[PDB]
Design a protein around this ligand. Structure first.
Ligand SMILES: NS(=O)(=O)c1cccc2c1c([N+](=O)[O-])cc1[nH]c(=O)c(=O)[nH]c12
Lengths: 54, 41, 98, 98, 49
């Protein structure tokens, strides 16, 4: 559920960077959010499988 | 074990079989001819 | 049962009064005669009093007490909650209800 | 028929002192009931006073053990191959070599 | 006739051929590590990189 919250925040950052071109730091934020969202979706997969086992 | 109907050897045979089961012979005989005389291991 | 006889970790116990103790006492089979000798003088007494007591001891010994009972009761116990018992191996003898 | 529970609660047995059968077997030999539909084991001692029918349930002596299950390997179960002290002393040796 | 008490009890049983070991498989080098382990290794590689 946190990957979905982070991917959504990445879209806002990408959209924000389409109306405020001067701020170059709103694009790096999007990247980190997406990258961190991917990392949070690995723990979900492992947690799912691990817990589903036992 | 079967006997002719009305025979006098019915009851004695019934007790003979039953005693051999409590004693353990009927189980010893099986293991002898199934596993002791076996060929697999 | 041969596996249990070699092992000394998991204890096994019959009932004091009944046919599940006479069978081992009179058994002429070494794989069972060995178990009778140990079970006789072993302490604490594995010999239990009631079938319910034996079931509890198995369920209250964390895989350390093996109970020797009839295949009918064991299958019924095994199929009645908590569901913490199971049937292993095969029948050591052959009897019948008539 | 008319079902009637045995007052004594014993399956059957011979006192061996007064040789008075007590239980279902006694409830048949001494003219009290005409049929015993129960898990009454077939034995030689009883066969000399009653006539069983053919077994309706073949059984025997089995082994019951506490039901096992998974061992839920711990999260950090990859450090087992080496004791805790080795792991602690590897870090120390690393900080010292560097 | 009058049969005596059974001196032995038996029943219908299933007979098969003993598993003669097992023929190997093409992609049988992945047996040690489960499917999930292999899948998550790919995900961790794509992530670390
Ligand atoms: N419930 S039990 O714990 O397994 C059990 C324990 C001990 C003796 C039993 C017995 C049962 N039973 O199972 O039904 C039947 C039965 N029948 C006989 O005729 C006899 O003499 N002794 C017994």
């Amino acid at each position: 559920i946190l990957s979905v919250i982070l991917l959504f925040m990445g879209g806002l950052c990408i959209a924000a960077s389409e109306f405020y071109k001067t701020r170059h730091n709103i694009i790096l934020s999007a990247g980190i959010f997406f990258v961190s969202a991917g990392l949070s979706n690995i723990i979900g997969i492992i947690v799912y499988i691990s817990a589903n086992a036992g | 074990v079967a006997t002719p109907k009305g025979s006098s050897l019915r009851t004695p045979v019934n007790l003979a079989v039953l005693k051999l089961s409590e004693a353990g012979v009927l189980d010893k005989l099986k293991n002898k001819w199934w596993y002791d005389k076996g060929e697999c291991g | 049962a041969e596996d249990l006889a070699k092992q000394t970790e998991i204890a096994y116990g019959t009932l004091d009064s009944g046919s599940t103790k006479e069978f081992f006492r009179r058994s002429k089979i070494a794989v069972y005669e060995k178990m009778w000798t140990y079970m006789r003088s072993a302490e604490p007494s594995v010999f239990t009093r009631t079938t319910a007591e034996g079931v509890a001891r198995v369920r209250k010994s964390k895989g350390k007490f093996a109970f020797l009972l009839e295949s009918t009761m064991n299958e019924y116990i095994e199929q009645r909650k908590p569901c913490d018992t199971m049937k292993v191996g095969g029948n050591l003898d052959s009897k019948g209800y008539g | 028929y008319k079902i009637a529970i045995v007052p004594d609660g014993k399956y059957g047995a011979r006192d061996a002192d007064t040789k008075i059968w007590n239980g279902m077997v006694g409830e048949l030999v001494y003219g009290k009931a005409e049929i015993a539909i129960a898990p009454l084991t077939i034995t030689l001692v009883r066969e000399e006073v009653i006539d069983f029918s053919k077994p309706f349930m073949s059984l025997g002596i089995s082994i019951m053990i506490k039901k096992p299950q998974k061992s839920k390997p711990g999260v950090f179960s990859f450090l087992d191959p080496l004791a805790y002290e080795i792991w602690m002393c590897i870090v120390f040796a690393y900080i010292g070599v560097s």
